[PDB]
Design a protein around this motif. Structure first.
Motif, short mmCIF file in Angstrom:
data_model
loop_
_atom_site.label_atom_id
_atom_site.label_comp_id
_atom_site.label_asym_id
_atom_site.label_seq_id
_atom_site.Cartn_x
_atom_site.Cartn_y
_atom_site.Cartn_z
N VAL E 35 -9.98 60.24 115.46
CA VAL E 35 -11.09 61.32 115.56
C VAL E 35 -11.05 62.42 114.82
N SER E 39 -10.22 70.11 119.98
CA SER E 39 -10.62 71.36 120.69
C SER E 39 -10.24 72.51 119.86
N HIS E 42 -13.73 72.18 117.12
CA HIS E 42 -15.14 72.21 117.34
C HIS E 42 -15.66 73.54 117.47
N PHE E 44 -17.90 76.58 119.37
CA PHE E 44 -17.68 77.24 120.74
C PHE E 44 -16.33 77.42 120.94
N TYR E 45 -15.14 76.98 120.39
CA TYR E 45 -13.89 77.53 120.61
C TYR E 45 -13.39 78.61 119.68
#
Ligand SMILES: [Mg+2]
Ligand SMILES: [Mg+2]
Ligand SMILES: [Mg+2]
Ligand SMILES: [Mg+2]
Ligand SMILES: [Mg+2]
Ligand SMILES: [Mg+2]
Ligand SMILES: [Mg+2]
Ligand SMILES: [Mg+2]
Ligand SMILES: [Mg+2]
Ligand SMILES: [Mg+2]
Ligand SMILES: [Mg+2]
Ligand SMILES: [Mg+2]
Ligand SMILES: [Mg+2]
Ligand SMILES: [Mg+2]
Ligand SMILES: [Mg+2]
Ligand SMILES: [Mg+2]
Ligand SMILES: [Mg+2]
Ligand SMILES: [Mg+2]
Ligand SMILES: [Mg+2]
Ligand SMILES: [Mg+2]
Ligand SMILES: [Mg+2]
Ligand SMILES: [Mg+2]
Ligand SMILES: [Mg+2]
Ligand SMILES: [Mg+2]
Ligand SMILES: [Mg+2]
Ligand SMILES: [Mg+2]
Ligand SMILES: [Mg+2]
Ligand SMILES: [Mg+2]
Ligand SMILES: [Mg+2]
Ligand SMILES: [Mg+2]
Ligand SMILES: [Mg+2]
Ligand SMILES: [Zn+2]
Ligand SMILES: [Zn+2]
Lengths: 48, 178, 116, 71, 57, 134
Positions: E35, E39, E42, E44-45
């Motif tokens: 990948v 988390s 990315h 928004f984190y």
RNA sequence: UUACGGCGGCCACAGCGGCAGGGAAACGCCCGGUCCCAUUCCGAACCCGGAAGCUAAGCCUGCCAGCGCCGAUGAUACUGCCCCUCCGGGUGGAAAAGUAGGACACCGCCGAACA
RNA sequence: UGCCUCCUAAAAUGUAACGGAGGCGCCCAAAGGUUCCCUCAACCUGGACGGCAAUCAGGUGGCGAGUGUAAAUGCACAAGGGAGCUUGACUGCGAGACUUACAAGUCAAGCAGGGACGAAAGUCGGGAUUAGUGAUCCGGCACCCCCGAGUGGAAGGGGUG
RNA sequence: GUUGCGUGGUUCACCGCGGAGGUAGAGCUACUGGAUGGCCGAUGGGUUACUGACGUCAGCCAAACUCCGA
């Protein structure tokens, strides 16, 4: 559509029971285990 | 051992206890189950969802789902009674823990235009619901062997009795909210 | 809560067809996560004639597990019933499924003398 | 209009306190308007016969009206 | 009933370009999964017309 | 005055006996018309009386009709022999017993109110009196 | 005998709901799925081995007329039989609704601590 | 024009009309038997397609759903819903009853044989119940070997289904 | 109905006791339907004075309505 069928003992060939069935739903010959008074016990029965 | 469950039992329980002054240790909110269902529309047409829904839900989750058949008949939807319209699975225990961990880690950020889960989709009792709209980004399923695209929804059920407690539990678990 | 309600529901359903008389009392059971209980009711006047449980000397006279304890209390209740003068009873599941500890109770009584 | 069916002669046949013999029909009915009690069978069409000789007794069994035979 | 119905659920490990790597049990893929976003990386984190006229003239 | 629906088009005639037990007092207005005899008051009679009251008062006041003609009456064709099936409904009728209050009226002027109520009463096929709200 | 766990009787005057207090034995909540057993998927349930923790829940005790329930007396409706030409009357029964009120159950058997 | 259900029908039963409303001349090899388990409709809240109403979750909900089929009486204790195994949709009987002019019709505990399910207690002689049907005569078929026109056969008759 | 032969109070009347009921009546926020006037306002109408659903407040009706009930 629902004719009157007769069941005969598979051993002694005696006709012991008469009943009905749906010809389309059961196009083949009915098979059941019923008490045969002649044989003195329960035997397989088939349509005639 | 589920790492998210271990992290929960280590610190999230204490955090919830600090946030809400529970008189006993088992008044603390805890997630009970996670439910994922299809509700497909190809029930009256082509009737092929065993490969369309089950074959992907099994690999997405970890257990084969249960098939749900129509509870009634609707002419407008061309809905008859007795044929499957939806497939539902529920995840519980360590399987639920692992599924939630994998989701919150790699699946939720990885869909198109991820702007965060809305924190207002609670049912009012302490359980949350949201759903996607396509074959999800789960690496367990790849586009190369999928039929027509279909989305799914998740229901997460918690021991919390209030929406604020449910939101706090999800936030502590790692749900990205607004 | 709901487990209690559903157990009571199942027990009533099975009791709809099962009473037990003075000559043929009711082998009732009551199983908990820690113990079990058993008594003969004679559902004609509500008068228990024999009873047993898993809280006796058998609570430490344990040759094994809860199944062994159930076997022992089955022997005990069979002896109590023989002392009372009872040799036919009707087994009451109590709403629990037959098998396991309940089966051990039942067959322990069966080979200990009760004709059910 | 104008059609009808035969009257079926339903209802209670033996009343409370009556002495009956074994097998006596007590109540002809559709469904279980009354319910069998002690010493009272039902019958293939809800017929509530007497399984023993005795006296009829009507009662209540938590909602259901019951007919029983006392010996 | 878990005899042949449920898909295989065996231990796996996730490797991310960021470096965030954890091991869980996943479905039929027994190998690794490659990948590029996790988390920890990315969004928004980790978080005027008048002005346009002013810069134009 | 016709019901929107009935479950039984052909019914037995309402029984004309006894005294009315309900609706025996004025409840809405302060003046009312109380029946003294049994009758089958029809929607035509009700409309006549209502128009009489309204067209005498000509303004102000309120009129309540606490009866509805929802009982049908049938009639066979004029030229037919006896007994070849029940006839088709023809009238809509309300079953009125003595003591039943038929109309309710409120008006500032007692004299005009009483005159309008009398005009209504003279249109009905009953002996009726005027009662007040005490 | 006190107050607990069961089994029953009865099926709301007993129910629903609210408010407080309890975990000795017990009853439960609870820990895991190795064994029996099971999920139209899930040890959620059932079943299996246990007591790390606890009365927060179930459960038990007490208090609440709140919703719900029971409910008079009197009067009236209706009515059997007579009188009577209808009107009505005599005589014998007698509601439903409403009101006063009642009510947050009662009773028996077994078992444990205490007796 | 026969059969089933309701009202008329006057609180046992029964009760007419060219009185008022509907159904039947079937269906199911499981929609039968047995063992075990479960509770619905509707409403509220939240949720991609999905909206009044598809499947999901949580509350409220004691029967307002459902019952193969008309209506009535019943069924939530389920007779409603799900699953496992099976053929009692038996044979020889049947005390005693309902209804009834007669002929018919209906219910039936229990006994025996041989079985199904159930650990056992037990339940099972079709279907929640009540319609889905046609007397006698005359013929057909299978079986038993009862009579067999001098005798032995046979024809023909007889009994059971 | 009469009459022969059997039986003899078993018939009937009143009093007491044990029973099933759904008519009269009544009620209906106890169901299925009808139905008057307000309050609230569902939809539809060209910002809505127009239809005014559901509930709720009072008053009602029913052979095929009954929580009741002579
Ligand atoms: Mg088939
Ligand atoms: Mg009839
Ligand atoms: Mg039958
Ligand atoms: Mg009234
Ligand atoms: Mg006049
Ligand atoms: Mg303790
Ligand atoms: Mg578990
Ligand atoms: Mg507790
Ligand atoms: Mg507490
Ligand atoms: Mg009184
Ligand atoms: Mg009253
Ligand atoms: Mg109360
Ligand atoms: Mg009648
Ligand atoms: Mg009658
Ligand atoms: Mg026809
Ligand atoms: Mg069935
Ligand atoms: Mg079956
Ligand atoms: Mg069923
Ligand atoms: Mg047959
Ligand atoms: Mg017989
Ligand atoms: Mg046998
Ligand atoms: Mg039998
Ligand atoms: Mg049928
Ligand atoms: Mg002839
Ligand atoms: Mg010869
Ligand atoms: Mg021959
Ligand atoms: Mg009476
Ligand atoms: Mg009636
Ligand atoms: Mg009346
Ligand atoms: Mg009503
Ligand atoms: Mg009536
Ligand atoms: Zn044979
Ligand atoms: Zn990363």
């Amino acid at each position: 559509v629902r004719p009157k069928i007769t069941l005969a003992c598979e051993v002694c060939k005696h006709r012991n029971y008469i009943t009905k069935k749906n010809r389309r739903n059961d196009p083949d010959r009915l098979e059941l285990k019923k008490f045969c008074p002649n044989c003195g016990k329960h035997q397989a029965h088939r349509e005639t | 051992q589920p790492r998210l469950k271990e992290r929960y039992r280590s610190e999230i329980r204490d955090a919830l206890r600090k946030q809400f002054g529970y008189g006993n240790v088992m008044q603390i909110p805890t997630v009970t189950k996670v439910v994922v269902n299809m509700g497909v529309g190809e029930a009256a047409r082509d009737a092929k969802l065993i490969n369309g829904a089950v074959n992907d839900l099994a690999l997405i989750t970890g257990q084969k789902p249960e098939v749900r058949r129509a509870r009634k008949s609707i002419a407008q939807f061309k809905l008859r009674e007795g044929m499957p319209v939806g497939v539902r699975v529920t995840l519980r225990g360590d399987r639920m823990w692992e599924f939630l961990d994998r989701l919150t880690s790699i699946a939720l950020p990885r869909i198109r235009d991820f702007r965060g889960l809305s924190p207002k989709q609670f049912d009012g009792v302490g359980n949350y619901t949201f759903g996607l709209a396509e074959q999800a980004v789960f690496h367990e399923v790849d586009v190369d062997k999928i039929d027509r695209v279909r989305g799914m929804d998740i229901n997460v059920v918690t021991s919390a009795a209030t929406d604020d407690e449910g939101r706090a539990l999800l936030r502590a678990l790692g749900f990205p909210f607004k | 809560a709901t487990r209690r309600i559903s157990r009571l529901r199942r027990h009533t359903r099975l009791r709809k067809k099962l009473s037990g008389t003075a000559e043929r009392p009711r082998l009732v059971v009551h199983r908990s996560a820690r113990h079990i209980h058993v008594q003969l009711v004679n559902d004609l006047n509500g008068t228990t004639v024999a009873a047993a449980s898993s809280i006796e000397a058998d609570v430490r006279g344990v040759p094994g597990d809860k199944k062994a304890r159930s076997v022992r209390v089955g022997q005990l209740i069979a002896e109590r019933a023989k002392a009372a003068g009872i040799d036919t009873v009707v087994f009451d599941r109590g709403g629990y499924t037959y098998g396991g500890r309940i089966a051990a109770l039942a067959d322990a009584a069966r080979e200990n003398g009760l004709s059910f | 209009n104008g059609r009808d069916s035969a009257a079926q002669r339903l209802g209670v046949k033996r009343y409370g306190g009556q002495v009956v013999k074994a097998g006596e029909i007590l109540v002809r009915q559709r469904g279980t308007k009354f319910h069998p009690g002690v010493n009272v069978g039902r019958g293939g069409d809800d017929t509530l016969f007497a399984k023993t000789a005795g006296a009829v007794e009507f009662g209540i069994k938590r909602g259901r009206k019951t007919v029983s035979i006392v010996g | 009933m878990k005899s042949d119905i449920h898909p295989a659920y065996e231990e796996t490990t996730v490797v991310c370009g960021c470096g965030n790597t954890f091991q869980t049990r996943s479905t039929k893929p027994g190998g690794r999964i490659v990948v590029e976003v996790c988390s920890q990386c990315h969004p928004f984190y980790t978080g005027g017309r008048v002005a346009r006229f002013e810069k134009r003239y | 005055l016709i019901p929107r629906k009935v479950k039984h088009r052909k019914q037995h005639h309402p029984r004309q006996r006894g005294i009315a037990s309900g609706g025996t007092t004025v409840n809405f207005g302060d003046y009312g018309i109380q029946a003294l005899e049994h009758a089958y008051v029809t929607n035509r009679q009700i409309e006549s009386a209502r128009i009489a009251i309204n067209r005498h008062i000509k303004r102000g006041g309120k009129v309540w009709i606490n009866i509805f003609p929802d009982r049908p009456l049938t009639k066979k064709p004029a030229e037919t022999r006896m007994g070849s099936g029940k006839g088709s409904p023809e009238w809509w009728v309300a079953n009125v017993k003595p003591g039943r209050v038929l109309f309710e009226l409120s008006y500032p002027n007692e004299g005009v109110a009483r005159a309008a109520l009398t005009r209504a009463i003279h249109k009905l096929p009953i002996k009726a009196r005027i009662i007040t709200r005490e």
